Design an enzyme around this catalytic site. Structure first.
Site, PDB file in Angstrom:
ATOM      1  N   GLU A   8     -21.170 -59.046   8.896  1.00 47.56           N
ATOM      2  CA  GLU A   8     -20.713 -59.971   9.092  1.00 47.56           C
ATOM      3  C   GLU A   8     -20.627 -60.633   7.458  1.00 47.56           C
ATOM      4  OE1 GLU A   8     -24.155 -62.026  10.445  1.00 47.56           O
ATOM      5  OE2 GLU A   8     -23.739 -61.190  12.358  1.00 47.56           O
ATOM      6  N   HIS A  18     -24.118 -55.907   5.471  1.00 47.71           N
ATOM      7  CA  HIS A  18     -23.612 -56.748   6.896  1.00 47.71           C
ATOM      8  C   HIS A  18     -22.101 -56.677   6.957  1.00 47.71           C
ATOM      9  CE1 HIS A  18     -24.785 -58.884  11.089  1.00 47.71           C
ATOM     10  NE2 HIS A  18     -25.596 -58.090  10.423  1.00 47.71           N
ATOM     11  N   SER A  41     -28.020 -56.020  19.367  1.00 46.39           N
ATOM     12  CA  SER A  41     -28.536 -56.746  20.583  1.00 46.39           C
ATOM     13  C   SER A  41     -30.042 -55.355  20.887  1.00 46.39           C
ATOM     14  CB  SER A  41     -27.352 -56.217  21.569  1.00 46.39           C
ATOM     15  OG  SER A  41     -25.693 -57.374  21.970  1.00 46.39           O
ATOM     16  N   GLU A  86     -24.982 -50.417  12.710  1.00 46.09           N
ATOM     17  CA  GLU A  86     -24.483 -51.458  14.188  1.00 46.09           C
ATOM     18  C   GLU A  86     -23.856 -51.869  14.416  1.00 46.09           C
ATOM     19  OE1 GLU A  86     -25.500 -55.773  12.496  1.00 46.09           O
ATOM     20  OE2 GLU A  86     -27.181 -55.149  13.035  1.00 46.09           O
ATOM     21  N   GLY A  96     -24.661 -59.441  18.654  1.00 48.40           N
ATOM     22  CA  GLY A  96     -24.734 -60.614  19.463  1.00 48.40           C
ATOM     23  C   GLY A  96     -24.099 -61.133  20.590  1.00 48.40           C
ATOM     24  N   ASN A 141     -33.745 -59.904  11.240  1.00 56.20           N
ATOM     25  CA  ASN A 141     -32.478 -60.196  10.221  1.00 56.20           C
ATOM     26  C   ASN A 141     -32.723 -61.903  10.773  1.00 56.20           C
ATOM     27  OD1 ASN A 141     -30.015 -61.049   8.953  1.00 56.20           O
ATOM     28  ND2 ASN A 141     -29.059 -59.585   9.681  1.00 56.20           N
ATOM     29  N   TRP A 142     -33.025 -63.101  10.626  1.00 58.62           N
ATOM     30  CA  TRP A 142     -32.819 -63.886  11.410  1.00 58.62           C
ATOM     31  C   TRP A 142     -31.268 -64.654  11.033  1.00 58.62           C
ATOM     32  CZ3 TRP A 142     -37.743 -67.791   8.895  1.00 58.62           C
ATOM     33  CH2 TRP A 142     -38.613 -66.650   9.121  1.00 58.62           C
ATOM     34  N   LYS A 143     -30.462 -64.353  10.244  1.00 54.65           N
ATOM     35  CA  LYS A 143     -29.314 -64.918   9.693  1.00 54.65           C
ATOM     36  C   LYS A 143     -29.023 -66.222   9.784  1.00 54.65           C
ATOM     37  CE  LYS A 143     -27.198 -60.916  12.858  1.00 54.65           C
ATOM     38  NZ  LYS A 143     -25.980 -60.837  13.981  1.00 54.65           N
ATOM     39  N   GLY A 200     -31.213 -58.645  15.635  1.00 60.67           N
ATOM     40  CA  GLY A 200     -30.471 -59.589  15.009  1.00 60.67           C
ATOM     41  C   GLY A 200     -30.976 -61.145  15.949  1.00 60.67           C
ATOM     42  N   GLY A 201     -30.816 -61.783  16.975  1.00 59.44           N
ATOM     43  CA  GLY A 201     -31.066 -62.661  17.291  1.00 59.44           C
ATOM     44  C   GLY A 201     -32.488 -62.543  18.023  1.00 59.44           C
TER      45      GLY A 201
END
Lengths: 251, 251
Positions: free
Chosen positions: B99, B97, B215, B169, B175, B9-11, B236-237
């Protein structure tokens, strides 16, 4: 002395393949129509997933815009696209459309954040404001407009106050086939210009472009464009049809 | 006997040009890593505006997914993309998600509508569920999970109940650089599988893929994958970095 704008909001219609085919159909006639003196600026606003496909057809001037973006530079906002991303493919971004205010809870405050982000990334924002049927029937149109201008169009510098575009879209005129009369659209668009003047001064209010949206077709575009205060149109369902070219012709 | 999945997931990171460059960097090594026996299914989920650019690099197997879509076929939803559009470029779509649940007000009910729409258009949905810090500290994790499974993952046929992917999640793990321990992730993911079993039966629960997100790096992916009930990861990141390849290697 304001340059007119015809912007086509495709909404959630035409994926990548269909978007390219549609632009291949309309581009020769649309480009020729835009060569005539006094033609408006013309902006196509496809779904974000379809921007690259339309860009490829156009790059073989009609401008490209996005239908929404987020206001941060980058980061942990799954599903959102940033102003930097939009600028790679687009000159313009629609913000605060009533469909986003109603279905997805967007506020004046969030719209303003997106508006500043657009301006600070050299994007032209088309900021949508407008009252719904109940507000209109109960005489609250003027109060709603004032509230939305002061909040959605806040924080602008004098130079930016000249770059934004406002779109007045009576929510009761969207997709119903019942556009506002030219007289009603002109009355409210002059109120928007007056409220803008109250904040930003007479000169800024004289250069800002204000469009009418809501059931615009090539049959009624001239009715709106006849008013000096109406600078163009945000076109919905007709932007999916060849009639979009004839809107440009009749503008 | 479930095929594992590593989804990135590049967001809201990497516009069209940057997305193509990133995939040009990672694709040779990533493709070679995926040739090894027992490799997971690998899905890249760039911003929607960047899907075409990544598609063009890949088409010169790594799959492509979207980070969100709407549930109607088409229509007057400014700023949204439809399942039909996503399917032109993608096999997969992330839904629900945290977010989007927190910043953009998405509900279990809306997530379920999008989930059925994905399945009915031959898209693989990755449906995100999870508790926040306050819910976790107050002992409400199990109740939140049960509520989200029964509502977000409702209405599935037996065949569909086999096609979905669930991502657990913990919102406190996103993050923050503080992933759940393997023991905590396994405990909740087994609860998800139990709740799924309660609705859909033992066989369906045995084939559904459940991922851990929050994470995830190549340093801790093996800690999660060691548990039989954990079928992969929503990254994620680290999906923005070459470490994504090493997550695949260590999975």
């Amino acid at each position: 002395g304001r340059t007119a704008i015809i912007a086509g909001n495709w909404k959630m219609n035409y994926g990548p393949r269909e978007a390219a085919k549609f632009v291949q159909e309309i581009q020769p006639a649309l480009s020729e129509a835009l060569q005539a003196p006094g033609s408006p600026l013309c902006i196509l606003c496809p779904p974000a997933i379809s921007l690259a496909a339309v860009r490829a057809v156009l790059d073989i001037q009609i401008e490209l815009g996005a239908q929404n973006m987020y206001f941060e530079e980058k980061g942990a906002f799954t599903g959102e696209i940033s102003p930097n991303m939009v600028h790679e493919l687009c000159t313009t971004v629609i913000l605060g459309h009533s469909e986003r205010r109603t279905y997805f809870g967007e506020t004046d405050e969030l719209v303003n954040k997106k508006t500043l982000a657009a301006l600070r990334h050299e994007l032209r924002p088309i900021v949508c404001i407008g009252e719904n049927e109940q507000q209109h029937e109960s005489g609250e149109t003027a109060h709603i407009i004032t509230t939305q201008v002061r909040a959605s169009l806040a924080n602008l510098t004098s130079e930016q106050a000249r770059e934004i575009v406002i779109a007045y879209e009576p929510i009761w005129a969207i997709g119903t086939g019942k556009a506002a009369t030219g007289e009603i659209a002109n009355n409210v668009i002059r109120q928007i210009r007056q409220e803008y003047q109250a904040i930003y001064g007479a000169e800024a209010a004289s250069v800002v472009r204000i469009l009418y949206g809501g059931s615009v077709t090539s049959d009624n575009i001239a009715e709106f464009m006849a008013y000096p205060d109406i600078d163009g149109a945000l076109v919905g369902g007709a932007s999916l049809k060849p009639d979009f070219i004839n809107i440009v012709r009749n503008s």
